[PDB]
């Protein structure tokens, strides 16, 4: 039995709903759909967006209205979900949803954008630190883990169109790239790069005219698994053709 998981930063759930979300969801038919940037309390959602036939949905909004938020649609519900690392400043921004599926924990994370200020870059880097502590604790306790979402950092030069121009911009700073190195070194695998070693493979493009059309993008969205679990991963790909956000979805197929 194969399990298909999709991750997608939708840049506002109500917005992507106007741009073909439900039609796409019905075509792709994943077992689990992880979303970032819902920008809505579930009460603000139309019924047909809240309840999609065949799926249980779980929403983790931020405390701040119209900001951040993650969600998960799943055919089979998890035994429970955890919505934080146990650190207040990281747990109130609707960034963390960790679903316990028994065979694995699924971390659906919307990692912070560090571009707007030094304080928010510090927040991003400390969030990275808290995340690594959390996943390591779970992995060390014997859990297999799948981590998906918007990491807001491109790992290597291959992972964005303009590496030189962005080496002093959050998203491609040496310190952020070093954190991704450290994460992987701790025993996790960037699943896309198990299967695809090509350039030009991005998950995000500015809305600035022509950016997406010129493939001036960044790979910001990833599926990671712990090393012990990588043998179960069959596919990891980018759904580059799917419109409606400044990010496109990414996919993982596993067989347990
Ligand atoms: Mg956005």
The binding site comprises 11, 37, 150, 152, 247
CA distance 162 to 24: 30
Number of structural domains (the chain) is: 1
Q: What DSSP letter does each residue of 78-116 carry, written as one string?
A: -S-EE---S-HHHHSSS-EEEEE-SS-EEEEEEPPP-SS
Could you count the other beta carbons within 10 Å of the beta carbon of residue 187?
Answer: 14
Q: How far is the CA of 65 from the centre of ligand 1 (A)?
A: 14
Q: How far is the CA of 159 from the centre of ligand 1 (A)?
A: 19
- In 3D space, the residue among 219, 46, 252 whose CA is nearest the CA of residue 146 turns out to be 252
CA distance 238 to 63: 31
Positions marked active-site: 150
Q: 233 near 225, Cβ under 8 Å?
A: yes
How determined? X-ray
Q: How far is the CA of 198 from the centre of ligand 1 (A)?
A: 26
Edge-to-edge order in the sheet of strand 70-74: 56-60, 70-74, 32-36, 2-9, 250-255, 233-238
DSSP bridge partners of 15: none
- In 3D space, the residue among 206, 10, 185, 214 whose CA is nearest the CA of residue 115 turns out to be 206
Domain hosting residue 242, numbered range = 1-256
Site of tokens 């952020």: 176
- Residue 67 corresponds to which tokens in the numbers above? 């900001």
The binding site for Mg(2+) comprises 11, 37, 150, 152, 247
Distance, CA of 169 to chain centre? 20
Resolution to 1 decimal, in Å? 1.9
Backbone phi and psi for residue 16, each to the nearest 5 degrees, phi listed first: -65, -25
Which residue pairs from 53-59 have beta carbons closer than 8 angstroms and sit at least 24 positions apart in sequence? 58/97, 58/99
Q: How far is the CA of 141 from the centre of ligand 1 (A)?
A: 34
- Residue 91 corresponds to which tokens in the numbers above? 């747990």
Q: What DSSP letter does each residue of 225-237 carry, written as one string?
A: EEGGGGGGEEEEE
Q: How far is the CA of 57 from the centre of ligand 1 (A)?
A: 21
CATH number reported for the structural domain that contains residue 23 in this entry? 3.60.10.10
């Amino acid at each position: 039995t194969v399990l298909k998981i999709i991750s997608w930063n939708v840049n506002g759930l109500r917005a992507v709903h106007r741009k073909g979300f439900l039609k796409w969801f019905m075509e792709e038919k994943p077992d689990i759909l992880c979303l970032q940037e819902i920008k809505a309390a579930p009460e603000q959602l139309p019924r047909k967006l809240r309840h999609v036939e065949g799926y249980r949905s779980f929403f983790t909004p931020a405390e701040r209205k119209g900001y951040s938020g993650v969600a998960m649609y799943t055919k089979v519900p998890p035994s429970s979900l955890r919505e934080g690392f146990g650190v207040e400043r990281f747990d109130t921004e609707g960034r963390i949803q960790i679903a316990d599926f028994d065979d694995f924990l699924l971390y659906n994370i919307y990692f912070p954008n560090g571009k707007m200020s030094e304080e928010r870059l510090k927040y991003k880097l400390e969030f990275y630190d808290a995340f690594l502590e959390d996943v390591n604790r779970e992995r060390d306790s014997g859990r297999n883990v799948i981590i998906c979402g918007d990491f807001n950092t491109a790992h290597r030069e291959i992972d964005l169109a303009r590496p030189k121009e962005n080496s002093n911009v959050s998203g491609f700073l040496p310190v952020e790239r070093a954190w991704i190195d450290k994460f992987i070194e701790n025993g996790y695998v960037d699943t896309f790069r198990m299967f695809n070693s090509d350039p030009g493979q991005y998950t995000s493009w500015s809305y600035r005219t022509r950016a997406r059309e010129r493939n001036v993008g960044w790979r910001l969205d990833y599926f990671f698994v712990n090393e012990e679990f990588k043998g179960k991963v069959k596919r990891s790909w980018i759904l580059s053709d799917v419109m409606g956000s400044d990010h496109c979805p990414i996919g993982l197929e596993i067989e347990l």
